[PDB]
């Protein structure tokens, strides 16, 4: 096109600025409580709810 400019269409530098991501699992995990005697199975849990 011009042979003298990088990024011939001249995008905004913020366009080429990168994006970083961090999942919430890294911030805090999710624990799973094992079933208790009151709700031995998920059927009983749903019936109680």
């Amino acid at each position: 096109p011009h042979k003298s400019y990088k990024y011939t269409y001249m995008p905004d530098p913020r366009k080429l600025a990168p994006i970083e991501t961090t999942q919430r699992s890294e911030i805090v995990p999710q624990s799973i409580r094992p079933p208790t005697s009151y709700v031995p199975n998920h059927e009983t849990f749903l019936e109680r709810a």
């Binding site: 990024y7 011939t8 269409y9 995008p11 080429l16 990168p18």
Partner: protein
């Protein structure tokens, strides 16, 4: 001997060459000058224009001549369709990359090739003083866009270590198999396993339909739970079920084609050592080869691999005729 950026070139804007170049342009934070070679300059113009519009972080330069590509690029990666094009681009052309290679250049061809071609390419590169790697890529173009490809690199360990930061831009599973040609051998083994498992999955779904199982998801679930799980089966369960249910439907096209699979298996057979007059008696591999050949002999070579289900019996009839000819 000045300080600059690496000149990284990509040769072949086919189906898999575009995602590689796009990944390099996107993930190269101005750390490389991206050269893109094309047989027709219109394709290179289109690729560079699309990369620039989508937003590329590295400057790009288009090429239509292997001589200019060699004089510019410090590292070259070739992603072509067949073996003939790769052989012409590397050894046969007057401006062939390997024959005209400079002392220090690194040429990596991701195209699946034969063992003899890989050996001769490595020998010529070593004689010229450059470095050559055969890294047959594995995966669909969508997987290459996601960057989760598969590379089996054979050659110099130091060269593989140096080229790792470039491979990781479009491939996550990179395995340095060993000396030159080990990547080609691993690709041959993988292709043979793929064909065998595709034939097995097609037969399994055919017998499922024969027995009466009327759901494919509920079958693939228990198959994955059990020891009969297979990637090809999981991928091709719905299409194979539909094709079995309605034989009139013509299987669709895909990047992994019957003709290409047959060509790769033919290269594997050519590189397979012989035991004299008779060949190696692999029953499952021979059955898969015959079924795939019967499928391709119906104009379905450019369609998906699932077409083998309609020509299992075609291959069997052809084998029976050929065996009855001398009987």
């Amino acid at each position: 001997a000045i300080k600059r950026s690496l000149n990284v070139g990509v040769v072949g804007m086919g189906n898999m060459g575009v995602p590689i170049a796009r990944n390099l342009g996107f993930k190269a934070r101005s750390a490389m000058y991206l050269q893109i070679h094309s047989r027709a300059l219109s394709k290179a113009k289109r690729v560079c224009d699309d990369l620039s519009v989508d937003g590329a972080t590295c400057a790009m330069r288009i090429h239509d001549r292997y001589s200019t590509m060699t004089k510019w690029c410090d590292v070259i990666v070739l992603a072509l369709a067949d073996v003939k094009a790769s052989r012409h681009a590397l050894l046969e052309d007057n401006e062939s990359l390997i024959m005209n290679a400079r002392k220090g250049q690194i040429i990596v061809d991701h195209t699946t090739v034969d063992a003899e071609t890989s050996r001769e390419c490595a020998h010529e590169a070593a004689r010229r003083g450059a470095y050559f790697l055969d890294a047959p890529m594995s995966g669909s173009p969508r997987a290459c866009f996601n960057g989760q490809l598969l590379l089996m690199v054979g050659g110099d360990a130091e060269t593989f270590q140096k080229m790792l930061p470039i491979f990781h831009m479009y491939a996550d599973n990179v395995f340095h198999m060993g000396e030159s040609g080990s990547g080609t051998a691993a690709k041959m083994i993988s292709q043979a396993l793929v064909a065998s498992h595709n034939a097995a999955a097609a037969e399994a779904l055919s017998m499922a339909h024969a027995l009466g199982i009327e759901d494919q998801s509920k079958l693939v679930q228990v198959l994955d739970a059990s020891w009969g799980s297979s990637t090809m089966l999981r991928r091709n369960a719905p299409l194979l079920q539909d094709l079995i249910r309605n034989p009139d439907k013509t299987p669709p096209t895909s990047a992994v084609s019957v003709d290409r699979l047959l060509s790769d298996l033919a290269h594997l057979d050519a590189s397979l050592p012989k035991r004299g007059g008779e060949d190696e008696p692999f029953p499952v591999f021979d059955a898969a080869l015959r079924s795939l050949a019967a499928a391709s002999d119906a104009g379905m070579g450019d369609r998906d691999l699932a077409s083998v289900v309609h020509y299992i019996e075609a291959g069997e009839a052809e084998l029976r005729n050929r065996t009855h000819v001398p009987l």
